[PDB]
């Protein structure tokens, strides 16, 4: 589990950029306010 | 829901956003679609199961 990826963003990187914020993510219409539905941690981990 | 059943919606035209927008629905989900994107596309038929 050492080993992830960010799965959500509001925008594609340009290139040889780079994001290090683990700021939550509005998937769709939820309030969200840094807390759920559409609520998403923007990182996965690939659990090889 | 071994024998579900089918209803038809044909042309019309509407808003989808409310399918998660309303209070109503615990879950929603699309396959092929994005939520938002419902309100500019177009389909020959649409088929509630």
Redesign the interface.
């Given at each position: 589990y050492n080993y992830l990826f960010r799965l959500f963003r509001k925008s594609n990187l340009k290139p040889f950029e780079r994001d290090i914020s683990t700021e939550i993510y509005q998937a769709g219409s939820t309030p969200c306010n840094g807390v759920g539905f559409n609520c998403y941690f923007p990182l996965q981990s690939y659990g090889f | 829901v071994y024998a579900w059943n089918r209803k038809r919606i044909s042309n019309c035209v509407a808003d989808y956003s409310v399918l998660?927008?309303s209070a109503s629905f615990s879950t929603?989900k699309c396959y092929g679609v994005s939520?938002t994107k419902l309100n500019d596309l177009c389909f020959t038929n649409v088929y509630a199961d």
């Open positions: - | 998660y927008n929603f939520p």
